[PDB]
Structure 1
Amino acid sequence: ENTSENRAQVAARQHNRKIVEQYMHTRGEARLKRHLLFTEDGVGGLWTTDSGQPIAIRGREKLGEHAVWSLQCFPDWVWTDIQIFETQDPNWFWVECRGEGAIVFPGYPRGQYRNHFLHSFRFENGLIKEQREFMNPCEQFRSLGIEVPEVRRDGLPS
């Protein structure tokens, strides 16, 4: 049904989708300004780490400082195979993608890093309020030359 309230929802979803697309295509020196897509109190970061706790980055200014580090440590990073998922909530989207690039972490040799990612994007007033990234930390261990722990799964059917 075509009501002003359904129209408002569609418009919000369309606006927010464009912001998700811009985020996922932001590369190179543009990464230094990605934070501008966030609310002033917006949070971003990595939810899947070896410690089990997230690396949450709180606030638009912190996000921008993080991006200086990110560009140093992942200097040519690109997201590919981007699939955007709208949800029943006009302010909530999911993205499934791949990413690849050099990894340059101090204390490890330079490597090439590939991973599979899910990202969650929640909006408020057309800006991102919360972004979360989910990946397999084991693939990051491999890129850094760190031995990956192995689980045996005896009797697992074949």
Structure 2
Amino acid sequence: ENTSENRAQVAARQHNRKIVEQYMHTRGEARLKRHLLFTEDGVGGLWTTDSGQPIAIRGREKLGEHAVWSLQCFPDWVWTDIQIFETQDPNWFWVECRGEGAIVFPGYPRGQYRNHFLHSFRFENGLIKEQREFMNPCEQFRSLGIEVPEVRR
């Protein structure tokens, strides 16, 4: 039905999608300004770690600071094979993609990291309130030369 309320939901979804697109395509020195796509108190980070607990970066300015470190850790990172999924919630999107780049972590040899990824993006007032990355940490272990435990099946 073509009502004001359905139009507002569609418009929100359309603006939000453009922001998810911009986010996934941000490369190089532009990564230092990606934090500006977040709400002041927005959160980003990695939900799948070896420890089992998320590594959550809280607040737009914290996200900006961490982006400096990750530009050294992942100096040429690119996302590839990007698929964006809109949902019933105009303020919630999922993304499936791959990613590849050098990995340069303190205390490890320099490596090449490739993985498959799922991302969750929640919006409030047109800016990103929560971004969460999901991946298989065993692939990152391989990239760092960390022996991967194996489950006998």
TM range (shorter): over 0.9
Deviation of 1:63 (Å): 0.1
Stretches of structure 1 lacking an aligned partner (at least 5 in a row)? 154-158
* Displacement after TM superposition at 1:106 (Å): 1.0
Instruction: Give the secondary structure class of the aligned counterpart of 1:51.
Output: coil
Corresponding residue number in structure 2 for 1:12: 12
Secondary structure in structure 2 of the residue aligned to 1:52: coil
3-state SS in 2 of match to 1:89: coil
Q: C-alpha deviations, 1:2-31, integer Å up to 9, x for none?
A: 000000000000000000000000000000
- What CA distance in whole angstroms lies between the structure 2 residues aligned with 1:150 and 1:88? 39
Using the size of structure 1 for normalisation, the TM-score is: 0.96
Give, in angstroms, the shift of residue 38 of structure 1. Answer: 0.1
Give the length in aligned residue pairs: 153
Q: Give the CA RMSD over aligned residues.
A: 0.3
Aligned with 1:96: secondary structure? strand
Determine the C-alpha separation between the residues in 2 that align with 1:60 and 1:151.
Answer: 40
Larger radius of gyration: 1
SS state of the match for residue 94, structure 1? strand
Tell me, in whole angstroms, the C-alpha distance in 2 between the residues paired with 1:109 and 1:43: 30
Q: Which runs of 4+ in 1 moved over 3 A?
A: none
- 2:75 counterpart SS class: coil
Identity of aligned residues (%): 100
| Deviation sequence 1:21-56 (CA, Å, 0-9, x none) | 000000000000000000000000000000000000
Deviation, structure 1 residue 116 = 0.2
Cα-to-partner distance string for 1:48-71 (whole Å, 9 max, x where unaligned): 000000000000000001100110
